[PDB]
């Protein structure tokens, strides 16, 4: 039996992302558009800073910029919380600690509007060093593969997620960003609370050679695993 949630993701789905950001008082907005193809775990998105120059490095926003698009193997379908919350959606909250620097806190509401999967995000960043790796833009425009570890948070009717990102600094060192995440359904309906597993991510960051606004093209593949 295919759930209503699953059924919404069987083909290519347009995506709209809207973010309002304030990091150490530097305010900015970003919009993104693209499409997701959950059958293949494939995300293709282009983001544009609509307020001018982005005040932080684009790579620090990659994790913020729709896990309902992950490819869950058939044998793990009972563990896909993200799709089971659709179309009413879910709220994703994170705190991202940059080691030896500031922190982002984010709140993202992810839901369908008609045929478009929409994500509305607010990001607040505080305690950054104005000449640290983030505000001083010292991070390379590239990205590593990682695993993201998901567990049920039964008491919250949602999930708890942890993981670490290691951003390459331009001197060959690394800027650790420790992510703590939780997701909770927006609706009151039943959702799938998963056994422990993980999502395997691969990301490639690129530029649109015809685009003059500050922007990032993101191509990401996401696959659930760890339960066999």
Contacts with F ion by CB under 5 A lie at 67, 92, 183
Minimum gap (Å) between residue 109 Cβ and F ion: 11
Minimum gap (Å) between residue 67 Cβ and F ion: 4
Cβ-based nearer residue to F ion, 67 or 84: 67
Minimum gap (Å) between residue 64 Cβ and F ion: 10
Q: How far apart are CA 206 and CA 197, in angstroms?
A: 30
Q: How far apart are CA 23 and CA 95, in angstroms?
A: 13
Minimum gap (Å) between residue 14 Cβ and F ion: 18
Give the H or E element holding residue 4.
helix 4-7
Neighbouring-strand partners of residue 15: 34, 117
Alpha-carbon Rg for the chain in angstroms: 17
| Phi, psi values for residue 75, rounded to 5° | -75, -10
Minimum gap (Å) between residue 134 Cβ and F ion: 22
Q: How far apart are CA 54 and CA 27, in angstroms?
A: 9
Cβ-based nearer residue to F ion, 135 or 161: 161
Cβ-based nearer residue to F ion, 119 or 175: 119
* Half-sphere CA count of 28, side-chain side, radius 13 A: 22
Cβ-based nearer residue to F ion, 67 or 175: 67
Q: How far apart are CA 123 and CA 185, in angstroms?
A: 20
Neighbouring-strand partners of residue 126: 103
Minimum gap (Å) between residue 165 Cβ and F ion: 15
Minimum gap (Å) between residue 87 Cβ and F ion: 16
Cβ-based nearer residue to F ion, 67 or 133: 67
Cβ-based nearer residue to F ion, 13 or 135: 13
Q: How far apart are CA 68 and CA 90, in angstroms?
A: 10
Cβ neighbours of residue 97 under 8 Å, at least 6 residues apart? 103, 177, 178, 180
Q: How far apart are CA 48 and CA 50, in angstroms?
A: 6
Helix-strand-coil percent breakdown of the chain, rounded to 5? 10, 50, 35
Cβ-based nearer residue to F ion, 60 or 67: 67
């Amino acid at each position: 039996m295919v759930s209503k949630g699953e059924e919404l993701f069987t083909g290519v789905v347009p995506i709209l992302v809207e973010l309002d950001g304030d990091v150490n008082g530097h305010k900015f907005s970003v919009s993104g558009e693209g499409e997701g193809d959950a059958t293949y775990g494939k995300l293709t998105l282009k983001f544009i800073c609509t307020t001018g120059k982005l005040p932080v490095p684009w790579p620090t926003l990659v994790t913020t910029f729709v896990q309902c698009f992950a490819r869950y193997p058939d044998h793990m379908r009972q563990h896909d919380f993200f799709k089971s919350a659709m179309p009413e959606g879910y709220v994703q909250e994170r705190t991202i600690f940059f080691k030896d620097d500031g922190n982002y806190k984010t709140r993202a509401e992810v839901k369908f509007e008609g045929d478009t999967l929409v994500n509305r995000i607010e990001l607040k960043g505080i305690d950054f060093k104005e000449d640290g790796n983030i505000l001083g833009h010292k991070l390379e425009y590239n990205y590593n593969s990682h695993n993201v570890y998901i567990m049920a948070d039964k008491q919250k009717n949602g999930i708890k997620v942890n993981f670490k990102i290691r951003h390459n600094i331009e001197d060959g060192s690394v800027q650790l960003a420790d992510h703590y995440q939780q997701n909770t359904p927006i609706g009151d309906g039943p959702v799938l609370l998963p056994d422990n597993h993980y999502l395997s991510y691969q990301s490639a960051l690129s530029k649109d050679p015809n685009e003059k606004r500050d922007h990032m093209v993101l191509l990401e593949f996401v696959t659930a695993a760890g339960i066999t």
